[PDB]
Structures are given as C-alpha cells and as structure tokens.
PDB file of all heavy atoms in Angstrom:
ATOM      1  N   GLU T   1     -82.438  32.745  24.264  1.00  0.00           N
ATOM      2  CA  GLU T   1     -82.998  33.010  25.568  1.00  0.00           C
ATOM      3  C   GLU T   1     -81.909  33.529  26.488  1.00  0.00           C
ATOM      4  O   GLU T   1     -80.842  32.936  26.598  1.00  0.00           O
ATOM      5  CB  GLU T   1     -83.644  31.729  26.119  1.00  0.00           C
ATOM      6  CG  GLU T   1     -84.665  31.101  25.194  1.00  0.00           C
ATOM      7  CD  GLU T   1     -84.930  29.636  25.459  1.00  0.00           C
ATOM      8  OE1 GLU T   1     -84.947  29.242  26.663  1.00  0.00           O
ATOM      9  OE2 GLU T   1     -85.124  28.868  24.500  1.00  0.00           O
ATOM     10  N   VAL T   2     -82.159  34.667  27.119  1.00  0.00           N
ATOM     11  CA  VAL T   2     -81.183  35.157  28.096  1.00  0.00           C
ATOM     12  C   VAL T   2     -81.881  35.497  29.396  1.00  0.00           C
ATOM     13  O   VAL T   2     -83.042  35.830  29.412  1.00  0.00           O
ATOM     14  CB  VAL T   2     -80.419  36.425  27.581  1.00  0.00           C
ATOM     15  CG1 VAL T   2     -79.658  36.110  26.339  1.00  0.00           C
ATOM     16  CG2 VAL T   2     -81.383  37.562  27.347  1.00  0.00           C
ATOM     17  N   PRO T   3     -81.156  35.360  30.515  1.00  0.00           N
ATOM     18  CA  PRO T   3     -81.668  35.737  31.835  1.00  0.00           C
ATOM     19  C   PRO T   3     -82.094  37.199  31.894  1.00  0.00           C
ATOM     20  O   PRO T   3     -81.639  38.015  31.081  1.00  0.00           O
ATOM     21  CB  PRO T   3     -80.476  35.498  32.770  1.00  0.00           C
ATOM     22  CG  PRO T   3     -79.720  34.401  32.114  1.00  0.00           C
ATOM     23  CD  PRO T   3     -79.827  34.682  30.635  1.00  0.00           C
ATOM     24  N   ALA T   4     -82.983  37.544  32.830  1.00  0.00           N
ATOM     25  CA  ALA T   4     -83.324  38.941  33.086  1.00  0.00           C
ATOM     26  C   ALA T   4     -82.044  39.739  33.357  1.00  0.00           C
ATOM     27  O   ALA T   4     -81.183  39.280  34.123  1.00  0.00           O
ATOM     28  CB  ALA T   4     -84.299  39.060  34.226  1.00  0.00           C
ATOM     29  N   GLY T   5     -81.930  40.904  32.714  1.00  0.00           N
ATOM     30  CA  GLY T   5     -80.817  41.786  32.984  1.00  0.00           C
ATOM     31  C   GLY T   5     -79.572  41.448  32.184  1.00  0.00           C
ATOM     32  O   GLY T   5     -78.565  42.174  32.227  1.00  0.00           O
ATOM     33  N   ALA T   6     -79.623  40.333  31.464  1.00  0.00           N
ATOM     34  CA  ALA T   6     -78.469  39.882  30.726  1.00  0.00           C
ATOM     35  C   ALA T   6     -78.392  40.520  29.353  1.00  0.00           C
ATOM     36  O   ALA T   6     -77.394  40.347  28.648  1.00  0.00           O
ATOM     37  CB  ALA T   6     -78.525  38.364  30.596  1.00  0.00           C
ATOM     38  N   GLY T   7     -79.404  41.287  29.007  1.00  0.00           N
ATOM     39  CA  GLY T   7     -79.480  41.942  27.682  1.00  0.00           C
ATOM     40  C   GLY T   7     -78.239  42.704  27.271  1.00  0.00           C
ATOM     41  O   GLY T   7     -77.610  42.354  26.250  1.00  0.00           O
ATOM     42  N   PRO T   8     -77.845  43.760  28.010  1.00  0.00           N
ATOM     43  CA  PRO T   8     -76.673  44.573  27.707  1.00  0.00           C
ATOM     44  C   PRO T   8     -75.388  43.777  27.477  1.00  0.00           C
ATOM     45  O   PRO T   8     -74.621  44.088  26.559  1.00  0.00           O
ATOM     46  CB  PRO T   8     -76.574  45.485  28.926  1.00  0.00           C
ATOM     47  CG  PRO T   8     -77.986  45.711  29.303  1.00  0.00           C
ATOM     48  CD  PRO T   8     -78.657  44.366  29.078  1.00  0.00           C
ATOM     49  N   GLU T   9     -75.132  42.794  28.322  1.00  0.00           N
ATOM     50  CA  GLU T   9     -73.927  41.979  28.180  1.00  0.00           C
ATOM     51  C   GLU T   9     -73.963  41.164  26.885  1.00  0.00           C
ATOM     52  O   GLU T   9     -72.947  41.057  26.176  1.00  0.00           O
ATOM     53  CB  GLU T   9     -73.716  41.062  29.393  1.00  0.00           C
ATOM     54  CG  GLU T   9     -72.509  40.144  29.284  1.00  0.00           C
ATOM     55  CD  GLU T   9     -71.200  40.935  29.285  1.00  0.00           C
ATOM     56  OE1 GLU T   9     -71.211  42.066  29.808  1.00  0.00           O
ATOM     57  OE2 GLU T   9     -70.176  40.419  28.776  1.00  0.00           O
ATOM     58  N   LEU T  10     -75.112  40.571  26.567  1.00  0.00           N
ATOM     59  CA  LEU T  10     -75.255  39.839  25.316  1.00  0.00           C
ATOM     60  C   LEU T  10     -74.998  40.753  24.124  1.00  0.00           C
ATOM     61  O   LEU T  10     -74.225  40.430  23.216  1.00  0.00           O
ATOM     62  CB  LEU T  10     -76.643  39.219  25.192  1.00  0.00           C
ATOM     63  CG  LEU T  10     -76.829  38.375  23.928  1.00  0.00           C
ATOM     64  CD1 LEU T  10     -76.390  36.941  24.172  1.00  0.00           C
ATOM     65  CD2 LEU T  10     -78.251  38.437  23.461  1.00  0.00           C
ATOM     66  N   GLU T  11     -75.614  41.927  24.162  1.00  0.00           N
ATOM     67  CA  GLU T  11     -75.484  42.904  23.093  1.00  0.00           C
ATOM     68  C   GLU T  11     -74.013  43.314  22.939  1.00  0.00           C
ATOM     69  O   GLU T  11     -73.506  43.473  21.832  1.00  0.00           O
ATOM     70  CB  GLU T  11     -76.355  44.120  23.381  1.00  0.00           C
ATOM     71  CG  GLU T  11     -77.832  43.810  23.314  1.00  0.00           C
ATOM     72  CD  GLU T  11     -78.715  44.985  23.710  1.00  0.00           C
ATOM     73  OE1 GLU T  11     -78.186  46.120  23.801  1.00  0.00           O
ATOM     74  OE2 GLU T  11     -79.921  44.782  23.934  1.00  0.00           O
ATOM     75  N   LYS T  12     -73.341  43.499  24.082  1.00  0.00           N
ATOM     76  CA  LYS T  12     -71.956  43.916  24.113  1.00  0.00           C
ATOM     77  C   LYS T  12     -71.092  42.888  23.358  1.00  0.00           C
ATOM     78  O   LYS T  12     -70.302  43.252  22.489  1.00  0.00           O
ATOM     79  CB  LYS T  12     -71.489  44.052  25.543  1.00  0.00           C
ATOM     80  CG  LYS T  12     -70.018  44.327  25.736  1.00  0.00           C
ATOM     81  CD  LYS T  12     -69.710  44.553  27.211  1.00  0.00           C
ATOM     82  CE  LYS T  12     -68.232  44.829  27.449  1.00  0.00           C
ATOM     83  NZ  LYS T  12     -67.967  45.120  28.875  1.00  0.00           N
ATOM     84  N   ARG T  13     -71.281  41.626  23.695  1.00  0.00           N
ATOM     85  CA  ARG T  13     -70.505  40.537  23.115  1.00  0.00           C
ATOM     86  C   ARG T  13     -70.775  40.400  21.612  1.00  0.00           C
ATOM     87  O   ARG T  13     -69.853  40.177  20.830  1.00  0.00           O
ATOM     88  CB  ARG T  13     -70.820  39.235  23.854  1.00  0.00           C
ATOM     89  CG  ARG T  13     -70.333  39.254  25.293  1.00  0.00           C
ATOM     90  CD  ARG T  13     -70.666  37.978  26.027  1.00  0.00           C
ATOM     91  NE  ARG T  13     -70.376  38.116  27.450  1.00  0.00           N
ATOM     92  CZ  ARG T  13     -70.316  37.129  28.311  1.00  0.00           C
ATOM     93  NH1 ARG T  13     -70.510  35.876  27.902  1.00  0.00           N
ATOM     94  NH2 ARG T  13     -70.061  37.386  29.593  1.00  0.00           N
ATOM     95  N   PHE T  14     -72.034  40.518  21.201  1.00  0.00           N
ATOM     96  CA  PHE T  14     -72.340  40.534  19.760  1.00  0.00           C
ATOM     97  C   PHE T  14     -71.617  41.690  19.031  1.00  0.00           C
ATOM     98  O   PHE T  14     -71.091  41.505  17.942  1.00  0.00           O
ATOM     99  CB  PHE T  14     -73.845  40.638  19.515  1.00  0.00           C
ATOM    100  CG  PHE T  14     -74.525  39.301  19.383  1.00  0.00           C
ATOM    101  CD1 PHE T  14     -75.024  38.645  20.495  1.00  0.00           C
ATOM    102  CD2 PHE T  14     -74.627  38.686  18.138  1.00  0.00           C
ATOM    103  CE1 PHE T  14     -75.635  37.421  20.387  1.00  0.00           C
ATOM    104  CE2 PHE T  14     -75.252  37.452  17.997  1.00  0.00           C
ATOM    105  CZ  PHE T  14     -75.755  36.812  19.140  1.00  0.00           C
ATOM    106  N   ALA T  15     -71.630  42.869  19.661  1.00  0.00           N
ATOM    107  CA  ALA T  15     -70.991  44.029  19.039  1.00  0.00           C
ATOM    108  C   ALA T  15     -69.514  43.779  18.848  1.00  0.00           C
ATOM    109  O   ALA T  15     -68.958  44.119  17.809  1.00  0.00           O
ATOM    110  CB  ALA T  15     -71.227  45.275  19.888  1.00  0.00           C
ATOM    111  N   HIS T  16     -68.896  43.169  19.855  1.00  0.00           N
ATOM    112  CA  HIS T  16     -67.477  42.805  19.794  1.00  0.00           C
ATOM    113  C   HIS T  16     -67.103  41.824  18.721  1.00  0.00           C
ATOM    114  O   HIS T  16     -66.030  41.902  18.125  1.00  0.00           O
ATOM    115  CB  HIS T  16     -67.011  42.264  21.173  1.00  0.00           C
ATOM    116  CG  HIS T  16     -66.922  43.295  22.225  1.00  0.00           C
ATOM    117  ND1 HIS T  16     -66.855  42.999  23.564  1.00  0.00           N
ATOM    118  CD2 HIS T  16     -66.838  44.645  22.169  1.00  0.00           C
ATOM    119  CE1 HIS T  16     -66.750  44.091  24.280  1.00  0.00           C
ATOM    120  NE2 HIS T  16     -66.742  45.123  23.445  1.00  0.00           N
ATOM    121  N   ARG T  17     -67.994  40.862  18.447  1.00  0.00           N
ATOM    122  CA  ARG T  17     -67.706  39.802  17.485  1.00  0.00           C
ATOM    123  C   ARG T  17     -68.520  39.908  16.211  1.00  0.00           C
ATOM    124  O   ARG T  17     -68.613  38.978  15.460  1.00  0.00           O
ATOM    125  CB  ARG T  17     -67.909  38.421  18.105  1.00  0.00           C
ATOM    126  CG  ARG T  17     -67.571  38.381  19.582  1.00  0.00           C
ATOM    127  CD  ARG T  17     -67.717  36.964  20.120  1.00  0.00           C
ATOM    128  NE  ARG T  17     -67.956  36.905  21.555  1.00  0.00           N
ATOM    129  CZ  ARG T  17     -68.334  35.810  22.199  1.00  0.00           C
ATOM    130  NH1 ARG T  17     -68.518  34.679  21.555  1.00  0.00           N
ATOM    131  NH2 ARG T  17     -68.540  35.862  23.527  1.00  0.00           N
ATOM    132  N   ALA T  18     -69.131  41.085  16.006  1.00  0.00           N
ATOM    133  CA  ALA T  18     -69.984  41.336  14.859  1.00  0.00           C
ATOM    134  C   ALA T  18     -69.291  41.020  13.534  1.00  0.00           C
ATOM    135  O   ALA T  18     -69.951  40.604  12.552  1.00  0.00           O
ATOM    136  CB  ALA T  18     -70.477  42.778  14.849  1.00  0.00           C
ATOM    137  N   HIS T  19     -67.978  41.218  13.503  1.00  0.00           N
ATOM    138  CA  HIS T  19     -67.256  41.139  12.233  1.00  0.00           C
ATOM    139  C   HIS T  19     -66.441  39.862  12.152  1.00  0.00           C
ATOM    140  O   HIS T  19     -65.424  39.812  11.454  1.00  0.00           O
ATOM    141  CB  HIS T  19     -66.370  42.367  12.065  1.00  0.00           C
ATOM    142  CG  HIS T  19     -67.137  43.662  12.057  1.00  0.00           C
ATOM    143  ND1 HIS T  19     -67.953  44.060  11.035  1.00  0.00           N
ATOM    144  CD2 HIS T  19     -67.200  44.646  12.983  1.00  0.00           C
ATOM    145  CE1 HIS T  19     -68.495  45.227  11.311  1.00  0.00           C
ATOM    146  NE2 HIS T  19     -68.049  45.625  12.515  1.00  0.00           N
ATOM    147  N   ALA T  20     -66.881  38.814  12.819  1.00  0.00           N
ATOM    148  CA  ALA T  20     -66.228  37.515  12.738  1.00  0.00           C
ATOM    149  C   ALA T  20     -66.829  36.702  11.583  1.00  0.00           C
ATOM    150  O   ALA T  20     -66.166  35.855  11.004  1.00  0.00           O
ATOM    151  CB  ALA T  20     -66.376  36.762  14.047  1.00  0.00           C
ATOM    152  N   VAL T  21     -68.065  37.001  11.274  1.00  0.00           N
ATOM    153  CA  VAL T  21     -68.809  36.276  10.243  1.00  0.00           C
ATOM    154  C   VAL T  21     -68.852  37.076   8.950  1.00  0.00           C
ATOM    155  O   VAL T  21     -69.292  36.590   7.919  1.00  0.00           O
ATOM    156  CB  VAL T  21     -70.263  35.998  10.722  1.00  0.00           C
ATOM    157  CG1 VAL T  21     -70.987  35.034   9.776  1.00  0.00           C
ATOM    158  CG2 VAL T  21     -70.256  35.465  12.145  1.00  0.00           C
ATOM    159  N   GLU T  22     -68.276  38.288   8.994  1.00  0.00           N
ATOM    160  CA  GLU T  22     -68.438  39.260   7.912  1.00  0.00           C
ATOM    161  C   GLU T  22     -68.079  38.813   6.505  1.00  0.00           C
ATOM    162  O   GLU T  22     -68.885  38.999   5.589  1.00  0.00           O
ATOM    163  CB  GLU T  22     -67.624  40.509   8.258  1.00  0.00           C
ATOM    164  CG  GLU T  22     -68.203  41.771   7.624  1.00  0.00           C
ATOM    165  CD  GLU T  22     -67.645  43.044   8.231  1.00  0.00           C
ATOM    166  OE1 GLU T  22     -66.563  42.992   8.829  1.00  0.00           O
ATOM    167  OE2 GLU T  22     -68.323  44.088   8.131  1.00  0.00           O
ATOM    168  N   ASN T  23     -66.894  38.234   6.330  1.00  0.00           N
ATOM    169  CA  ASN T  23     -66.483  37.704   5.037  1.00  0.00           C
ATOM    170  C   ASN T  23     -66.855  36.272   4.716  1.00  0.00           C
ATOM    171  O   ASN T  23     -66.255  35.683   3.787  1.00  0.00           O
ATOM    172  CB  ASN T  23     -64.967  37.878   4.868  1.00  0.00           C
ATOM    173  CG  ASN T  23     -64.569  39.258   4.375  1.00  0.00           C
ATOM    174  OD1 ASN T  23     -65.394  40.177   4.350  1.00  0.00           O
ATOM    175  ND2 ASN T  23     -63.313  39.402   3.963  1.00  0.00           N
ATOM    176  N   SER T  24     -67.797  35.687   5.430  1.00  0.00           N
ATOM    177  CA  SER T  24     -68.187  34.297   5.149  1.00  0.00           C
ATOM    178  C   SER T  24     -68.866  34.173   3.779  1.00  0.00           C
ATOM    179  O   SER T  24     -69.623  35.034   3.405  1.00  0.00           O
ATOM    180  CB  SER T  24     -69.095  33.744   6.245  1.00  0.00           C
ATOM    181  OG  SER T  24     -68.436  33.729   7.507  1.00  0.00           O
ATOM    182  N   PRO T  25     -68.499  33.143   3.032  1.00  0.00           N
ATOM    183  CA  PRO T  25     -69.085  32.989   1.692  1.00  0.00           C
ATOM    184  C   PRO T  25     -70.606  32.875   1.727  1.00  0.00           C
ATOM    185  O   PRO T  25     -71.156  32.082   2.484  1.00  0.00           O
ATOM    186  CB  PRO T  25     -68.445  31.703   1.162  1.00  0.00           C
ATOM    187  CG  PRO T  25     -67.182  31.593   1.941  1.00  0.00           C
ATOM    188  CD  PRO T  25     -67.517  32.108   3.315  1.00  0.00           C
ATOM    189  N   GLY T  26     -71.265  33.695   0.921  1.00  0.00           N
ATOM    190  CA  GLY T  26     -72.716  33.653   0.830  1.00  0.00           C
ATOM    191  C   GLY T  26     -73.399  34.426   1.976  1.00  0.00           C
ATOM    192  O   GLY T  26     -74.616  34.535   1.997  1.00  0.00           O
ATOM    193  N   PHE T  27     -72.620  34.936   2.902  1.00  0.00           N
ATOM    194  CA  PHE T  27     -73.204  35.669   4.025  1.00  0.00           C
ATOM    195  C   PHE T  27     -73.653  37.046   3.563  1.00  0.00           C
ATOM    196  O   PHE T  27     -72.867  37.787   2.949  1.00  0.00           O
ATOM    197  CB  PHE T  27     -72.223  35.797   5.183  1.00  0.00           C
ATOM    198  CG  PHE T  27     -72.776  36.503   6.391  1.00  0.00           C
ATOM    199  CD1 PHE T  27     -73.876  36.009   7.059  1.00  0.00           C
ATOM    200  CD2 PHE T  27     -72.197  37.694   6.839  1.00  0.00           C
ATOM    201  CE1 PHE T  27     -74.392  36.655   8.185  1.00  0.00           C
ATOM    202  CE2 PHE T  27     -72.704  38.345   7.966  1.00  0.00           C
ATOM    203  CZ  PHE T  27     -73.802  37.805   8.606  1.00  0.00           C
ATOM    204  N   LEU T  28     -74.908  37.404   3.847  1.00  0.00           N
ATOM    205  CA  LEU T  28     -75.414  38.699   3.375  1.00  0.00           C
ATOM    206  C   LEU T  28     -75.602  39.715   4.511  1.00  0.00           C
ATOM    207  O   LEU T  28     -75.895  40.876   4.257  1.00  0.00           O
ATOM    208  CB  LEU T  28     -76.760  38.478   2.667  1.00  0.00           C
ATOM    209  CG  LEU T  28     -76.720  37.641   1.387  1.00  0.00           C
ATOM    210  CD1 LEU T  28     -78.099  37.530   0.752  1.00  0.00           C
ATOM    211  CD2 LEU T  28     -75.721  38.267   0.414  1.00  0.00           C
ATOM    212  N   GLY T  29     -75.357  39.292   5.727  1.00  0.00           N
ATOM    213  CA  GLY T  29     -75.452  40.196   6.840  1.00  0.00           C
ATOM    214  C   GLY T  29     -76.377  39.731   7.928  1.00  0.00           C
ATOM    215  O   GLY T  29     -77.066  38.713   7.781  1.00  0.00           O
ATOM    216  N   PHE T  30     -76.399  40.448   9.043  1.00  0.00           N
ATOM    217  CA  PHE T  30     -77.266  40.080  10.138  1.00  0.00           C
ATOM    218  C   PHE T  30     -77.692  41.289  10.948  1.00  0.00           C
ATOM    219  O   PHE T  30     -77.082  42.343  10.902  1.00  0.00           O
ATOM    220  CB  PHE T  30     -76.577  39.044  11.045  1.00  0.00           C
ATOM    221  CG  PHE T  30     -75.705  39.638  12.133  1.00  0.00           C
ATOM    222  CD1 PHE T  30     -76.170  39.710  13.447  1.00  0.00           C
ATOM    223  CD2 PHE T  30     -74.430  40.079  11.864  1.00  0.00           C
ATOM    224  CE1 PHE T  30     -75.376  40.233  14.464  1.00  0.00           C
ATOM    225  CE2 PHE T  30     -73.630  40.598  12.878  1.00  0.00           C
ATOM    226  CZ  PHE T  30     -74.098  40.667  14.178  1.00  0.00           C
ATOM    227  N   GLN T  31     -78.796  41.091  11.656  1.00  0.00           N
ATOM    228  CA  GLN T  31     -79.260  42.076  12.652  1.00  0.00           C
ATOM    229  C   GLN T  31     -79.417  41.376  13.953  1.00  0.00           C
ATOM    230  O   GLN T  31     -79.845  40.207  14.010  1.00  0.00           O
ATOM    231  CB  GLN T  31     -80.581  42.729  12.217  1.00  0.00           C
ATOM    232  CG  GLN T  31     -80.520  43.506  10.912  1.00  0.00           C
ATOM    233  CD  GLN T  31     -80.583  42.606   9.680  1.00  0.00           C
ATOM    234  OE1 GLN T  31     -81.373  41.626   9.667  1.00  0.00           O
ATOM    235  NE2 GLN T  31     -79.787  42.913   8.675  1.00  0.00           N
ATOM    236  N   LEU T  32     -79.071  42.074  15.036  1.00  0.00           N
ATOM    237  CA  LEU T  32     -79.383  41.644  16.375  1.00  0.00           C
ATOM    238  C   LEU T  32     -80.612  42.407  16.849  1.00  0.00           C
ATOM    239  O   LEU T  32     -80.573  43.623  16.952  1.00  0.00           O
ATOM    240  CB  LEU T  32     -78.216  41.877  17.317  1.00  0.00           C
ATOM    241  CG  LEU T  32     -78.516  41.536  18.780  1.00  0.00           C
ATOM    242  CD1 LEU T  32     -78.785  40.047  18.936  1.00  0.00           C
ATOM    243  CD2 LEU T  32     -77.391  41.969  19.708  1.00  0.00           C
ATOM    244  N   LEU T  33     -81.695  41.693  17.148  1.00  0.00           N
ATOM    245  CA  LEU T  33     -82.952  42.313  17.522  1.00  0.00           C
ATOM    246  C   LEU T  33     -83.268  42.126  19.009  1.00  0.00           C
ATOM    247  O   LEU T  33     -83.409  41.000  19.472  1.00  0.00           O
ATOM    248  CB  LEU T  33     -84.087  41.719  16.705  1.00  0.00           C
ATOM    249  CG  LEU T  33     -83.945  41.853  15.194  1.00  0.00           C
ATOM    250  CD1 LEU T  33     -85.254  41.419  14.459  1.00  0.00           C
ATOM    251  CD2 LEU T  33     -83.569  43.290  14.822  1.00  0.00           C
ATOM    252  N   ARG T  34     -83.428  43.246  19.708  1.00  0.00           N
ATOM    253  CA  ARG T  34     -83.811  43.248  21.117  1.00  0.00           C
ATOM    254  C   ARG T  34     -85.326  43.186  21.272  1.00  0.00           C
ATOM    255  O   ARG T  34     -86.011  44.040  20.725  1.00  0.00           O
ATOM    256  CB  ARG T  34     -83.318  44.520  21.812  1.00  0.00           C
ATOM    257  CG  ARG T  34     -83.750  44.651  23.271  1.00  0.00           C
ATOM    258  CD  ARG T  34     -83.555  46.081  23.741  1.00  0.00           C
ATOM    259  NE  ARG T  34     -82.156  46.508  23.648  1.00  0.00           N
ATOM    260  CZ  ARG T  34     -81.766  47.602  22.998  1.00  0.00           C
ATOM    261  NH1 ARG T  34     -82.663  48.338  22.370  1.00  0.00           N
ATOM    262  NH2 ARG T  34     -80.479  47.940  22.981  1.00  0.00           N
ATOM    263  N   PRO T  35     -85.839  42.212  22.013  1.00  0.00           N
ATOM    264  CA  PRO T  35     -87.297  42.070  22.162  1.00  0.00           C
ATOM    265  C   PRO T  35     -87.898  43.203  22.992  1.00  0.00           C
ATOM    266  O   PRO T  35     -87.322  43.650  23.977  1.00  0.00           O
ATOM    267  CB  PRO T  35     -87.439  40.714  22.865  1.00  0.00           C
ATOM    268  CG  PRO T  35     -86.152  40.560  23.635  1.00  0.00           C
ATOM    269  CD  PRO T  35     -85.104  41.147  22.719  1.00  0.00           C
TER     270      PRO T  35
END
C-alpha cells in the first residue's frame, strides 16, 4: 500500500535495489506491478 502520488518514488527505489535479491538461492525473479 502506498500513498497517493507515491508511485514513482516507490518504483524508483525498487529499480535501484532490483539486483539485491538477484543471486539468492532458489530465486527465479520478480516483477513490480503498477496497479
């Protein structure tokens, strides 16, 4: 759940840390979905 208008900032932060989980064992990937 994010506040109104908070979308872009959330997306920004995910993009920045997208590759923190990348080499986790058993991890197959993820998508960030905007409603």
Side-chain angles (χ1 to χ4, degrees):
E1 306 159 36
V2 299
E9 178 66 22
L10 182 88
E11 292 175 15
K12 174 176 180 177
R13 294 179 190 194
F14 268 89
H16 287 164
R17 327 184 204 168
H19 301 289
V21 190
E22 207 164 22
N23 277 11
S24 297
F27 182 60
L28 296 181
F30 87 102
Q31 298 80 41
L32 176 65
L33 302 188
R34 177 196 300 125

